Structures are given as C-alpha cells and as structure tokens.
C-alpha cells in the first residue's frame, strides 16, 4: 500500500526487514541481538564472511580483487581514492557528468591537481554524455575517475571500460551497483555507499585489485587505509555490524531471487514503464538522452510547475512516498531501486496518469 | 535471563530495543522504516536535533561546545584530532596508561611527533596511575590526549583536568561517557564510539570547543573535518542513520530514568557489589589499585588457570555470556556498562560465589 520512492536512504526488501525485526532481540537463538556481540566473536565473523562471499558470488568478483566493508560513505571515498591509489604521481583524471561526479573532484583537489574532462553533451535538446573512446585521459595520471550513475540528474553511462591495461579506473557505483551485470575485471577500484541498492546508511563496499595495494599516502588514516583493511578483514577497527547483517541478508535475497541477471530484467520493465509514460504525456517531460537514462533514478518535470505542490499532495495521499526532485533541480524525481516492484513502478505510473487526467 | 557482558558491541537498553523491533517496519505511522527515509527529510531531521539536545541536556554541555556526528568510530577519531586541531604546531602530548591510549599515539605518528608520557605505575604490587599534576606537558604542544577508561586494563583516570587555559586537552571517552557526571569545560575535544554506552556500533560523538574549529589540515578528508561537519549539521553525507536514531532513544530512555546523577548512582552499586566479591574471594583477583579501578570494565583472574574453560562453560550455561577476558591480556572480564541492570551484576557474582564454592 505504500511505496517509498526515496533517494537514499531508500526502500530495504520487505522480507530482509521482516526477518531483520523478527531476530531484533534474539538473534540465532543466542538470546541477544546482532547489534549486541562482538565483532570478533565466530557468530559475527561467520556474517562477515557469509557476506562477502555472497557479493562475490553475484558480480562475479575475480580471485584478484579484495572486497572491503568500511565506514564512511561515498564521500568517504572521494578521499580514500586518492589517499590509497595515487602514489608518487601528483595527477588522475576525472570525467565529469554530473553532481556526484564533480564533488568526487572537488575532494580530489585536496590531494592532486585532477586533469578534469566535461563529457557532458546536448544532443537534440536531450542530456547525453560523450562516448568513452571520446574521452582525453593524460600520460602520467595514476588513475581515472567517473560515476556511472548520477541520482540527481538521472544520467547513466552504462559503456564498459575498455582502456589499456595501462589505465586504472575507479568509479562511484553507489546508486547503481548490483541492478545489471558488469566486468569487475575492467576496474581497478570500484566502491559503493550501502544505502541505496546494498543495505542501510554507514557501510560502505570498495573493490580493489590486488596489486593497487601497498601505495597508501601516510597521511591517510588507518580506518580508509585499503592495506590496513584487507590485512584485518576489514576488521580493523568496530565495524557498523547491524549494517554489515543487514547488507548479508540483501545478498542472499538477491540469490534467491535470481541474481543480478534476473533483477536486470526486472529494473528493464520497471524503467521501460515509468519512461513510457512519462514520453507519451504531454504533462511529464524528461530531458535525458534514452542512451543515457539512469533506470535506477527517474527525474522528471510537471509543464506546468503550479501544480507540484498538488502532485506532491495527491501523490502522498495515494501512498506514493518521497516523490520531490532533489533540493538543487527542483522538480520530481522517482528512485526505483532494486528493492521497489514492479507493482509499485505501477502503482506510481497509474497515479500519473490519472492526475494528468483530472489535471492536465 | 540471559545477561550480555560484551566489551562492545555491547547491550542496548531492553527497553529501547523493544521500541526499535515494534517500529522497525512501519516508523512515525510513516509506513516505512527509520532506514528507509531521507535524512534531509523534515522527520529525520527533527529525530537528529533532538538527539543532539538530549545529549547536550544529559552531560550539561556549554553553547561554546560543538557535538558532532560523525562515521569512522573511535579510530577514525585518533586520526581526526591530529588532522584538525594540530595548526601549525607539529607536537602533540600523550599520555599513556594503557592500550586505547597507546593506539592514539601510534596513529598520531602519521601525522606528528607526538610527546609521549607514560602515566604507568605499581603502587603495593597493584597497578595504578600517576595523579595528573605529575604529568609533564610539553611548551610547544598543539594539544594533550589521554584516554579515561581503558577497557582491556580495566583502569580509571577520573580526575578532573585542571591545566592552564592554554593547555588543550582531547579525550578519548568511548568506554565511559554518559556513566558519571563531567565537566565539559575542562575540555577541547571529547570523542566517543557509540557502540558502548550510547547506541549501536557505526556512530561516533565528538564534542568540540568552538574556536579550535577552522585550523584543519587540507589533507583531512571532509568526512572527518570538524568545521565542515559541523557547518552541515553533522550531514554533509548520508550519516549512519539507523545508529543516530537508536542513540536518541538510548538519551530519552537515560532521561526517563533520572538522568547522568542516576546513572552514576547505580554503576557505583554495581562496580562495588562486583568488586566486592573479587575482594573478599582468594579464587578471583583484580590487580588495579582501588583509585583506579574501572566500573565498567572489570577484569579478573582465577587463581588457577586451568578452569578458565570450565568458568566459561558453566557461566555460559547460567545465561552469562561474553566474561572471556581481552586476547592480548587473557583471563576473565565483566563489561558493566550503563544498560546493564544491577540485576544483571547481581546474577554474575551469585554465579562466582557458588562456581568457586564447587570447583575452589
């Protein structure tokens, strides 16, 4: 009855919060709950372990990759990268097509002089992003830097890596990770906020090949060192455990429903739905590029902006939760991760259509 | 029945577990979870700033005090008093009494040359700390840190700091704050993980004066920078939402119950009846001088080693989990932090008495 079409925080699969309240006191007959035991004792770090696994198991991660769970955030992130990957050079470049983008890059600052490349583009009154093989990388950069998903501007880049083996790319995959198969393989860095297809706010998941370890800048504190996480099995320090939980009981509802192939599948009819409607109204209108949509995050606008307070209204009345565009572009914005149905994609796409209706 | 001494994670209030489970999937007739809502949404902005004045209430802090709240616990934090209250000055004094004091000095390498002060002492075979008049501060220092309560020594520093206006003092309160009344005057920075007498792990509380804000060092990542946070409202990123909200009720439940003067009324009735039964017993023995005996971590030995597992077995079987004492320093150890009840203590020493009334 109702759907929470929030940013991030966003929307958990209602079976992993019904097991997550069921167990709240007494976890594994232990008579405690998770948020209660140590992180070092074995029911714990058979959680850990669990998880981990589990993840690797649904991207498919190579033996050469190190999967870490640390604290933070994806802003966290925007220091940890260079803090970790830069080593002795003083550069790394940056392609900017969005908001995510370009505060990775105000961070970075901090700690390099990042070469930025604007890949942003008009294409027939549509945003696009340029091709990948269009890109200017430079000469001595120690990596490459770009997010595949911005939640703001709704914009995707959906292309596979495909530099040479003389090119690290790392990437912000917070609001998009795990909806659509992708070659790890082709990364050098790939980390993720937890709170949008993952689990709940305050964990964080990096996926670092083997031997990008090792460079860390001093300066970089222990809790985001990524050698200091992998020699602790990300345990250095208290990691967020109910969190940690949570995220494993995700993975293993992804399994059992499919896997990222499946959930693909199912994010393509959600997305196909709602951009339908919204192509076909003359009350809706996105002005995204269709090769550059985001299917994760749907902004869009009313033409008639006199009427947003009354969609807003209406819309909560119908149980159509946190439906407002972010604080910086105004408008409205559905988030339809991978936890949000397609019975719920519906439900918002025939309110759509009736307000139009009885409005348009 | 079943009483959970874990050092930390460590027990949630009862009570406030109860409210957690009941509105785990349906928060503020919202129809959705505290972790599915935005955290710049005007609910879980309201639930934020009652914590923080709850918590500002509870421990009498002044309006030229900032509280922050942050991710990275309380190892994030050993590296974040360094990176932003250090200036220009390249020296720091440490005391150091134990392990969590020391950890804080070896991180503090990273970023200077930190002036090391051993307060360490053996008074009548037990051990103790020096008074703080006899701790040497250096001129040049930026500021001074020691740590309050360690908690795999089992050792107190409750001795109020009364050093010049000009000596900063930074400490590291993650095992004791909110178990006794404190002058929040005294200080510069105080620093806390949650995941010990506040709320569940992934959150970290600092309380910083004001005009040490706005002397970071550029390398600090943003996360972790005092003036940003601060200036943001502790929500510069996605916090650990989930965590934030667990410790507002944990505050709200700490004022239904008479506050930090109540607190500190019943921990002295539990570490006395504990300490007590050590005391009197030749079985078990504690070696911490009395002025420096902790009241929430309590240690102990057994006169002979070679029932450690068996102490453990049978414990365990009377419903009184995690005594195993810290690996690097072995034997046994209660954690009575503030959610566990006199009851709880009660049914720990009944056990003792008739353990070494059989196996003595």
């Given at each position: 009855?109702?759907?929470?079409?929030?940013?991030?925080?966003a929307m958990l699969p209602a079976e992993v919060l019904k097991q997550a309240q069921q167990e709240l006191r007494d976890w594994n007959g232990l008579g405690t709950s998770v948020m209660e035991v140590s992180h070092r004792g074995k029911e714990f770090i058979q959680v850990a372990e669990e998880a981990e696994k589990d993840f690797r198991d649904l991207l498919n991660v190579p033996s050469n990759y190190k999967v870490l769970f640390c604290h933070g955030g994806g802003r966290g992130q925007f220091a940890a990268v260079p803090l970790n990957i830069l080593g002795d050079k003083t550069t790394a470049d940056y392609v900017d097509a969005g908001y995510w983008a370009a505060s990775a890059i105000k961070e970075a600052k901090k700690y390099c002089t990042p070469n930025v490349f604007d890949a942003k583009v008009t294409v027939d009154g549509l945003r696009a992003?340029?091709?990948?093989?269009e890109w200017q990388l430079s000469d001595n950069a120690a990596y490459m830097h770009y997010c595949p998903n911005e939640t703001i501007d709704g914009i995707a880049i959906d292309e596979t890596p495909d530099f040479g083996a003389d090119v690290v790319?790392?990437?912000?995959?917070?609001?998009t990770i795990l909806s659509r198969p992708i070659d790890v393989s082709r990364y050098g860095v790939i980390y993720a906020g937890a709170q949008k297809n993952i689990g709940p706010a305050g964990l964080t998941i990096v996926i670092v090949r083997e031997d990008l370890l090792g460079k860390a800048n001093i300066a970089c504190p222990s809790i985001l060192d990524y050698s200091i996480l992998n020699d602790n099995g990300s345990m250095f320090n208290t990691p967020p455990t109910f969190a940690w939980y949570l995220s494993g009981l995700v993975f293993k509802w992804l399994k059992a429903n499919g896997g990222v192939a499946e959930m693909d599948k199912?994010?393509?009819?959600?997305?196909?739905?709602?951009?339908?409607?919204?192509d076909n109204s003359d009350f809706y209108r996105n002005d995204?590029?269709?090769?550059?949509?985001?299917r994760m995050n749907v902004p869009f606008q009313l033409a008639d902006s006199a009427l947003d307070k009354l969609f807003l209204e209406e819309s909560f009345a119908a149980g159509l939760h946190a439906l407002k565009?972010?604080?910086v572009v105004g408008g409205m914005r559905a988030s339809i991760y991978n936890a949000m149905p397609l019975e719920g994609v519906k439900a918002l796409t025939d309110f759509m259509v009736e307000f139009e209706r009885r409005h348009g």
């Open positions: 009855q109702i759907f929470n079409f929030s940013s991030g925080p992003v340029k091709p990948m093989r790319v790392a990437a912000d995959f917070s609001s199912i994010n393509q009819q959600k997305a196909e739905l709602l951009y339908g409607v919204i995204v590029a269709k090769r550059n949509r985001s565009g972010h604080r």
